[PDB]
Amino acid sequence: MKRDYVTTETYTKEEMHYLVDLSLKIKEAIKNGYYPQLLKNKSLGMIFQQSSTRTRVSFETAMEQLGGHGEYLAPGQIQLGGHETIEDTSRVLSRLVDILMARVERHHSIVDLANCATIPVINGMSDYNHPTQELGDLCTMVEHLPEGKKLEDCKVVFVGDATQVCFSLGLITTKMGMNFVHFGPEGFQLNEEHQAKLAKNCEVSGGSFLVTDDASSVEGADFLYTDVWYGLYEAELSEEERMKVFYPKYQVNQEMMDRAGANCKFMHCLPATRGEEVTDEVIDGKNSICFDEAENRLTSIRGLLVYLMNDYEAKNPYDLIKQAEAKKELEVFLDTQSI
Amino acid sequence: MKRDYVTTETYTKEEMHYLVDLSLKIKEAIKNGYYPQLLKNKSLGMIFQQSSTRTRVSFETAMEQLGGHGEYLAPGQIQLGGHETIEDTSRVLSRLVDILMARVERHHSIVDLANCATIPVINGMSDYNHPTQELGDLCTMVEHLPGKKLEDCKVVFVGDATQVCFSLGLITTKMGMNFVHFGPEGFQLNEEHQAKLAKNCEVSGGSFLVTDDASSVEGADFLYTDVWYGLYEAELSEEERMKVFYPKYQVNQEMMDRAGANCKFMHCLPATRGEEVTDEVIDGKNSICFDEAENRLTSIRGLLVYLMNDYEAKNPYDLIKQAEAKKELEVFLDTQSI
Amino acid sequence: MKRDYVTTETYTKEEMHYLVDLSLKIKEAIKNGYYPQLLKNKSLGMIFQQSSTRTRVSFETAMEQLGGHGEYLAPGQIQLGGHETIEDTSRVLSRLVDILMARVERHHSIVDLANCATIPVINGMSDYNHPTQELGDLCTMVEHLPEGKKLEDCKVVFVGDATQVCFSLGLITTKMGMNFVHFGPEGFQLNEEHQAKLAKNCEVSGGSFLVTDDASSVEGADFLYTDVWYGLYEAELSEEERMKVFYPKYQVNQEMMDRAGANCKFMHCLPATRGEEVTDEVIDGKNSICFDEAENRLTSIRGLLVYLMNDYEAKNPYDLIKQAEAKKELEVFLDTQSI
Ligand SMILES: N[C@@H](CCCNC(=O)CP(=O)(O)O)C(=O)O
Ligand SMILES: N[C@@H](CCCNC(=O)CP(=O)(O)O)C(=O)O
Ligand SMILES: N[C@@H](CCCNC(=O)CP(=O)(O)O)C(=O)O
Ligand code: NI
């Protein structure tokens, strides 16, 4: 048996709080130079169907820091998607690595990969959600809480396009009982199916959500978050197309930051298009935390990797008697046996 | 001095038996959570001219588990083939890594890579053979013996005369088993292939047959197949391979039943479901191709360890020089500043 | 605070001697089977915008041998250059790896990477220079000194095109007080800006330099070095064009080696186009050291990685009290808490 991390929908608020604490404890060790070897000799498979800096580097660095190794599987290097099915790739890699992640074009690909694998599977971003981004962002919001405010009393406003990141931020904030607002133009807002999911989260947590094109909605924001305008990796919008849709109403500039509040923090998942969704002045300003946010991609990924491997080991414990016997048997073989 | 693993033609049956035993001992250790650090701080170079999942991941996971590291060198990343010859690449990498593997478009590349390198070299598949697949398949058959001995078993390969087909021929006839290639005219193992299988058998007491007779599958303990689309660089179309192989060479439940109730299904993977094999067979109770994929890792761990142990035995470290060098570096780092 | 390795122009002769010595001491340890774990659990980011065998393999192997890991970031794998600016990539990776190297198309990219990063940055080759090649060639010339001669006693002649390797070799030889010659045809010689820098090196070092199309300039050389004729990776000179420029006058054949002197050594950064800049007979001959030179790409890279990380740790030391406290708190958490 095993557990996956495909969506935060299968995790309670309490479970996410455990993941934040675990991640932050590991972070404090490493920043002071103790590298806990919690994943010693473990191997991670890393399937990427799209380009990536933060997610990919975070997984490779995490494995090394914890005593294991991440294997990068680019497009064209593996047979998946043409000569081999998703179910076969899954069953095979279950025999070859200890834990698996994938960034996929279509959400169904990660669902199938997780369902057919006998080892833990992590979603590195699909067209539907970005759950490792969720934990990273939450870690970041915990570290940058406004003075005298609790997490659930905070207002988080996503500005612009209804990307997978926009939805994910909605899912995590509402899960933790916070107040979420998506400020976006008509035709590019979170849809009815998205909103019913936020509604289900809010009944349990006591949080709230709004989806609107009202410019005043930013007022009182403690966190202001944005993403790129050019859409999905495989079907980008042209510069001219996205400008007509979002510019200038949805550009996070200094006057918008001032409209939200003097203490409001700027967040972005990155990469950013400077001059489009955000100005140089904001992203490089004193209230930008999007570089601490990028650091926290690594923070959250270490905690998840450690939690899921701990979970797997508890469900599939090693036999220590058989372990010592096998060790002894290999050592005798190497001592006495020649080719 | 060194040893290579380019073809099992340079290995005796007894040597192949040792490699099996070593690989299985490592597997039982790791299965129970003991990772033997037998390749500590060693670097493997990995040249891939074609796509791979099982071979590539197996070498990377293998090195991590044993205390070392594998480096993936994909096409376009290195200058080999355009601005650099294979002999220079070989001489350069012999100075930069401890051990080398390559999956090549053409067999002469691995031959030349091995002969010019001063470090051990492994063939990760050519157009000619696939020797790490041979050891992995041998490990698999040992674990799934019918009660028969290995040398009493019949192994039928079904379909195209791929490099995997011939490699299975070589390993089975080397171990003294009974081999059949069941394939259509024009796509059978050729006269040069068969002469090598014949040389193996005269030594081992095994047997071989190349035929298009469907009754040849009867009594098979293992029934093995591969894809129909040929070489990576020049694939056969969907319409053309169907005309060549379908339905005669599709491994379906009728064929498995004709082989025998206890016949096991093997396939090197990736498989084209609905072509060389049906969903029913590959997902069925008698399919062992996923155990077989696991054993690509098993066999590769054993090979890396053997070849490095052999290398170390032939080029041993001077422990007096080792301690003197260690002391000198420590004195340097303690006392000297930029 | 940190230090970079972008150009040997920021390093004194005494500093370069230290680096050679460190690299040679590490080399002798590893050659005899002792792997010093000087970079335990550290991560190196490797940005490659061009193809590479020696530089890429040296970095990955170097990290494994010293206890760390190198991460390969190829073209198309990261969004830098299209959807992300050089400055943002630098600040982000500063949070995700410990040390960074890049092979860049344009020299301004490595300068910007280094200037914006809070971690050490190594130049893995640009269109301007190639400083890890410089240190490798220095280690190589030290190991192959003529009897009774010092490095500063030696005459080094570079043959052919004014490549970045040509200029770099000029920089490192003049820095160390040696006698450097560029033997190249008019229009393809080191320009006035290059020569002015060599002249300034010579004022301090006691060395000398000459740029000439005179064939007799090879006479009395202790090392004879060459490179390809096809120019830059992005803008290659065709076979017919380059042959018309250089062939046969600038081909390193046995006649040129004999003209240089019986004991003269042949050097080449590689890869070599046999039949163009050099013949089979010379590169495969008894006086060829280019494969030893290739080995010393790894020799020099190990020394550089260690020095820069030691420098960083000295400037940014870990606090051992906070380290132990962080270790204990993590250990307590894993013992007592569950999801
Ligand atoms: N809406 C964006 C989301 C990017 C999220 N960014 C990350 O995960 C950081 P990375 O891509 O460098 O890993 C898109 O669809 O591209
Ligand atoms: N005849 C096939 C052989 C593939 C063997 N499969 C493997 O080695 C598994 P891999 O490709 O995932 O490493 C071909 O030439 O393509
Ligand atoms: N003038 C040459 C310099 C190549 C240097 N070679 C190396 O650094 C060895 P590598 O490319 O294998 O890393 C060019 O611009 O191509
Ligand atoms: Ni690696």
Side-chain angles (χ1 to χ4, degrees), chain A residues 2-30 32-86 88-146 148-192 194-199 201-202 204-238 241-243 245-327 329-339, chain B residues 1-71 73-86 88-191 193-198 200-201 203-237 241-242 244-284 286-311 313-338, chain C residues 1-30 32-39 41-86 88-146 148-178 180-185 187-192 194-199 201-202 204-238 241-243 245-254 256-328 330-339:
Chain A
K2 56 83 178 262
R3 190 182 197 170
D4 300 314
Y5 192 76
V6 173
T7 168
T8 57
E9 289 164 277
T10 60
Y11 286 74
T12 64
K13 171 179 169 69
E14 290 67 31
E15 293 185 306
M16 297 311 299
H17 192 119
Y18 171 86
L19 293 176
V20 170
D21 284 8
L22 175 64
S23 291
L24 295 186
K25 294 268 183 266
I26 294 168
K27 182 182 184 172
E28 186 66 18
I30 285 170
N32 292 290
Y34 167 64
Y35 297 88
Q37 304 304 277
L38 304 164
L39 303 183
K40 179 67 190 172
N41 299 290
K42 300 305 173 179
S43 287
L44 170 74
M46 307 180 299
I47 297 160
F48 281 91
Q49 296 185 166
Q50 309 170 149
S51 72
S52 171
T53 302
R54 287 130 284 257
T55 307
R56 184 262 177 95
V57 170
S58 291
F59 275 108
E60 277 195 58
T61 299
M63 293 305 292
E64 169 59 28
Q65 288 185 327
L66 298 169
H69 187 241
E71 311 172 11
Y72 184 76
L73 303 168
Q77 288 177 4
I78 59 166
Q79 294 98 158
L80 170 66
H83 293 280
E84 196 163 25
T85 65
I86 189 79
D88 284 346
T89 299
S90 192
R91 289 170 88 174
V92 165
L93 292 178
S94 280
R95 306 292 191 110
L96 301 187
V97 294
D98 297 293
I99 189 162
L100 188 55
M101 66 75 51
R103 166 167 289 201
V104 297
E105 179 183 354
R106 292 289 178 258
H107 195 70
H108 73 76
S109 299
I110 200 79
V111 177
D112 298 341
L113 198 78
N115 281 184
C116 304
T118 57
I119 56 159
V121 170
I122 303 163
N123 178 4
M125 196 181 76
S126 66
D127 58 342
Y128 171 74
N129 68 342
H130 198 347
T132 65
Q133 187 73 55
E134 287 182 58
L135 189 55
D137 292 339
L138 179 55
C139 282
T140 314
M141 291 188 283
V142 167
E143 286 172 322
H144 290 270
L145 284 177
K149 279 191 179 179
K150 282 220 289 81
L151 188 73
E152 27 281 282
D153 286 345
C154 287
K155 186 177 179 183
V156 181
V157 179
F158 187 97
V159 187
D161 191 31
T163 66
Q164 75 280 271
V165 173
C166 166
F167 181 48
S168 271
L169 187 67
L171 286 173
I172 193 62
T173 56
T174 58
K175 172 77 61 159
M176 300 312 282
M178 308 174 72
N179 307 285
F180 180 73
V181 176
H182 174 210
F183 172 52
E186 218 265 63
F188 297 88
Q189 295 175 164
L190 289 167
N191 68 14
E192 286 203 86
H194 288 130
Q195 289 187 37
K197 273 159 169 42
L198 305 183
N201 275 193
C202 286
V204 173
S205 77
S208 74
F209 79 97
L210 184 65
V211 174
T212 180
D213 66 353
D214 190 327
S216 69
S217 67
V218 299
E219 290 184 38
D222 300 285
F223 297 101
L224 194 170
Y225 199 122
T226 204
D227 200 352
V228 297
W229 293 340
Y230 49 75
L232 292 166
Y233 185 80
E234 306 73 21
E236 289 168 325
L237 292 176
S238 71
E241 280 161 341
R242 58 199 198 248
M243 289 293 275
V245 173
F246 298 104
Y247 188 91
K249 187 173 167 190
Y250 298 90
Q251 181 190 65
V252 186
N253 58 201
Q254 193 55 236
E255 62 167 300
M256 192 187 280
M257 291 293 288
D258 292 1
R259 198 178 178 176
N263 287 316
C264 185
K265 302 292 173 183
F266 173 83
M267 297 181 75
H268 198 301
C269 57
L270 302 176
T273 311
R274 288 158 170 266
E276 282 191 24
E277 73 272 6
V278 67
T279 61
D280 293 327
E281 190 190 4
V282 175
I283 193 167
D284 295 334
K286 70 170 173 185
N287 285 329
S288 185
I289 64 168
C290 76
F291 295 101
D292 297 325
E293 188 182 356
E295 188 176 7
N296 281 342
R297 292 298 314 281
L298 173 56
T299 306
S300 55
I301 278 162
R302 288 186 300 235
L304 286 158
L305 283 170
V306 170
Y307 162 66
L308 288 162
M309 285 304 295
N310 282 178
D311 179 72
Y312 184 90
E313 193 174 347
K315 289 178 179 170
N316 300 268
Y318 293 119
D319 193 316
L320 298 163
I321 322 293
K322 287 180 191 183
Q323 183 183 102
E325 184 65 275
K327 181 172 182 174
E329 280 183 62
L330 170 68
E331 282 166 15
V332 170
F333 186 86
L334 289 164
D335 281 356
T336 55
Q337 227 55 238
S338 164
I339 198 163
Chain B
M1 306 163 281
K2 50 73 169 267
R3 197 178 187 171
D4 297 315
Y5 192 74
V6 177
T7 170
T8 58
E9 285 162 284
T10 63
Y11 287 75
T12 75
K13 173 177 179 180
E14 288 65 37
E15 290 181 314
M16 295 307 302
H17 175 66
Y18 169 88
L19 288 173
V20 168
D21 279 346
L22 172 66
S23 298
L24 298 185
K25 290 266 195 285
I26 296 164
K27 187 186 175 173
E28 190 60 32
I30 285 160
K31 185 191 177 176
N32 293 290
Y34 172 68
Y35 295 85
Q37 300 303 277
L38 302 165
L39 296 177
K40 191 57 181 166
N41 295 294
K42 301 302 175 183
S43 297
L44 163 77
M46 294 172 66
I47 299 171
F48 277 89
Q49 291 196 135
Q50 303 164 159
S51 62
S52 177
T53 300
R54 280 134 292 252
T55 308
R56 188 267 178 92
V57 174
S58 288
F59 277 110
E60 268 200 81
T61 301
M63 293 299 300
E64 173 54 29
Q65 293 178 328
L66 301 170
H69 183 258
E71 312 164 11
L73 317 176
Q77 294 180 11
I78 63 166
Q79 46 268 78
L80 161 64
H83 304 294
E84 196 158 34
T85 64
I86 192 72
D88 285 347
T89 298
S90 185
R91 285 159 86 157
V92 174
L93 294 181
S94 286
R95 310 292 195 112
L96 301 178
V97 294
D98 301 297
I99 185 161
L100 192 53
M101 71 75 50
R103 169 168 283 200
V104 289
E105 172 182 0
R106 283 293 185 270
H107 191 70
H108 70 76
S109 300
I110 197 70
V111 171
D112 296 338
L113 205 264
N115 295 167
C116 295
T118 54
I119 58 171
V121 169
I122 310 165
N123 180 2
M125 198 176 74
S126 67
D127 57 338
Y128 172 78
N129 68 337
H130 197 352
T132 64
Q133 183 80 58
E134 290 182 50
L135 185 61
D137 295 336
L138 187 56
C139 288
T140 307
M141 290 176 287
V142 162
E143 282 172 329
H144 289 271
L145 282 169
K148 297 184 197 182
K149 302 184 302 159
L150 196 73
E151 27 281 302
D152 296 299
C153 294
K154 187 180 179 180
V155 182
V156 182
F157 185 96
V158 181
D160 195 17
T162 71
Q163 73 288 79
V164 174
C165 174
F166 179 55
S167 277
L168 191 70
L170 290 169
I171 195 67
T172 55
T173 57
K174 169 134 295 155
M175 304 311 284
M177 309 170 75
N178 301 287
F179 181 75
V180 179
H181 177 213
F182 175 44
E185 205 141 80
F187 304 81
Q188 290 176 161
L189 293 171
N190 63 49
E191 295 273 50
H193 285 143
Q194 293 180 59
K196 284 171 168 60
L197 301 183
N200 275 200
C201 291
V203 171
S204 80
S207 68
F208 82 100
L209 177 72
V210 180
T211 186
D212 60 358
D213 189 344
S215 67
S216 67
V217 307
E218 291 165 15
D221 300 289
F222 301 101
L223 194 158
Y224 196 124
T225 197
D226 196 357
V227 297
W228 293 343
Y229 46 70
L231 296 164
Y232 179 84
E233 296 76 20
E235 290 192 13
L236 271 193
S237 66
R241 59 193 191 249
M242 291 292 277
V244 176
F245 297 107
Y246 190 92
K248 186 168 177 186
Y249 300 87
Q250 169 169 272
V251 182
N252 47 217
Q253 196 58 238
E254 180 213 305
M255 186 178 287
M256 295 287 293
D257 292 0
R258 189 171 185 174
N262 305 304
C263 189
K264 306 293 184 188
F265 177 76
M266 304 180 77
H267 193 307
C268 52
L269 310 182
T272 308
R273 287 155 173 272
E275 285 193 17
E276 69 270 17
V277 68
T278 61
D279 299 310
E280 190 180 8
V281 171
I282 187 159
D283 295 335
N286 280 313
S287 172
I288 60 172
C289 63
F290 299 105
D291 288 332
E292 181 186 1
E294 185 178 0
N295 285 336
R296 296 292 318 283
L297 175 53
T298 305
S299 54
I300 279 164
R301 286 191 299 241
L303 282 163
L304 289 169
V305 167
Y306 163 71
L307 293 162
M308 287 307 295
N309 283 174
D310 179 80
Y311 185 85
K314 290 171 173 157
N315 307 277
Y317 296 119
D318 183 332
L319 293 189
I320 315 270
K321 274 207 205 164
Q322 184 182 287
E324 173 68 1
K326 171 172 176 178
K327 183 178 72 173
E328 286 218 322
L329 172 65
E330 289 171 342
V331 176
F332 186 92
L333 287 165
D334 282 17
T335 64
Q336 215 82 319
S337 175
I338 197 156
Chain C
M1 296 178 291
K2 50 78 173 272
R3 197 186 187 161
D4 300 306
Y5 192 74
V6 179
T7 175
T8 59
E9 287 163 281
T10 63
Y11 285 77
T12 69
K13 188 253 250 82
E14 285 70 30
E15 295 185 311
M16 296 305 296
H17 177 70
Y18 170 90
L19 293 173
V20 166
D21 285 339
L22 176 59
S23 305
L24 289 179
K25 294 264 190 275
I26 294 167
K27 181 182 194 185
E28 186 69 28
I30 291 172
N32 290 293
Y34 173 63
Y35 297 96
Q37 298 306 268
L38 308 168
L39 305 184
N41 297 293
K42 300 295 172 182
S43 298
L44 164 78
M46 313 182 319
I47 301 171
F48 278 89
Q49 298 194 153
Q50 305 170 347
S51 77
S52 176
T53 302
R54 282 129 292 251
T55 309
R56 185 261 171 93
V57 175
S58 292
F59 271 107
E60 278 192 66
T61 290
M63 293 301 295
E64 168 61 28
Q65 285 176 339
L66 306 169
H69 181 252
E71 307 168 20
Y72 180 74
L73 320 173
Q77 292 179 5
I78 64 168
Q79 52 270 276
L80 163 73
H83 302 288
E84 197 160 31
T85 64
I86 190 73
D88 285 356
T89 293
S90 184
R91 300 169 71 170
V92 161
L93 291 174
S94 285
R95 311 288 195 111
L96 303 182
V97 294
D98 296 290
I99 190 162
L100 181 55
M101 68 77 48
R103 171 166 280 196
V104 296
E105 174 185 341
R106 294 282 85 113
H107 189 76
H108 75 78
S109 298
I110 196 75
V111 181
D112 295 353
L113 200 76
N115 279 203
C116 298
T118 55
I119 51 167
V121 173
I122 304 161
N123 184 356
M125 193 177 79
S126 64
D127 58 331
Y128 172 74
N129 72 338
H130 198 355
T132 70
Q133 185 73 51
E134 286 184 50
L135 188 67
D137 293 340
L138 207 51
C139 292
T140 309
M141 287 180 285
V142 169
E143 292 177 317
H144 291 273
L145 286 179
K149 271 192 175 180
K150 291 194 80 202
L151 205 50
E152 50 268 30
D153 289 320
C154 291
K155 177 179 170 168
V156 180
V157 181
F158 186 98
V159 182
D161 192 31
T163 64
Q164 77 288 81
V165 161
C166 171
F167 177 52
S168 261
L169 185 71
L171 288 177
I172 194 70
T173 57
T174 57
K175 171 132 293 170
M176 305 307 284
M178 314 178 70
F180 176 81
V181 181
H182 179 205
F183 174 47
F188 295 85
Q189 288 170 169
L190 290 168
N191 61 28
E192 286 262 77
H194 287 140
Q195 292 187 45
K197 276 166 168 61
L198 305 182
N201 271 189
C202 290
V204 176
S205 73
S208 64
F209 84 100
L210 181 72
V211 176
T212 191
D213 58 7
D214 195 341
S216 72
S217 69
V218 300
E219 289 161 32
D222 302 290
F223 300 95
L224 197 148
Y225 198 129
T226 194
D227 192 2
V228 292
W229 294 340
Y230 50 75
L232 298 173
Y233 180 82
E234 299 78 20
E236 283 191 25
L237 264 178
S238 63
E241 283 177 296
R242 68 191 188 245
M243 286 292 277
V245 172
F246 298 106
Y247 194 86
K249 185 183 183 180
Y250 298 94
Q251 166 169 98
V252 183
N253 41 225
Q254 195 55 234
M256 192 185 286
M257 297 288 296
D258 292 337
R259 194 181 185 158
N263 304 309
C264 186
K265 302 293 169 167
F266 173 79
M267 292 178 76
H268 196 306
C269 56
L270 305 176
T273 309
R274 296 156 166 267
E276 289 192 17
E277 69 268 17
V278 66
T279 60
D280 292 317
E281 164 177 21
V282 171
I283 186 156
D284 294 328
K286 80 176 188 191
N287 281 336
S288 178
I289 62 173
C290 60
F291 300 108
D292 283 346
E293 185 180 355
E295 185 180 352
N296 287 332
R297 293 299 314 282
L298 173 59
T299 300
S300 53
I301 278 164
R302 288 190 301 239
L304 283 163
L305 284 165
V306 170
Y307 163 70
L308 292 160
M309 282 310 301
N310 282 171
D311 180 74
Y312 184 90
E313 183 159 9
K315 290 168 172 159
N316 304 278
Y318 294 123
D319 181 72
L320 295 186
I321 315 285
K322 278 187 283 182
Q323 185 182 280
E325 164 75 74
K327 177 177 182 172
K328 186 184 173 182
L330 179 58
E331 279 168 1
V332 166
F333 182 88
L334 294 161
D335 286 347
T336 58
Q337 310 298 309
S338 79
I339 202 154

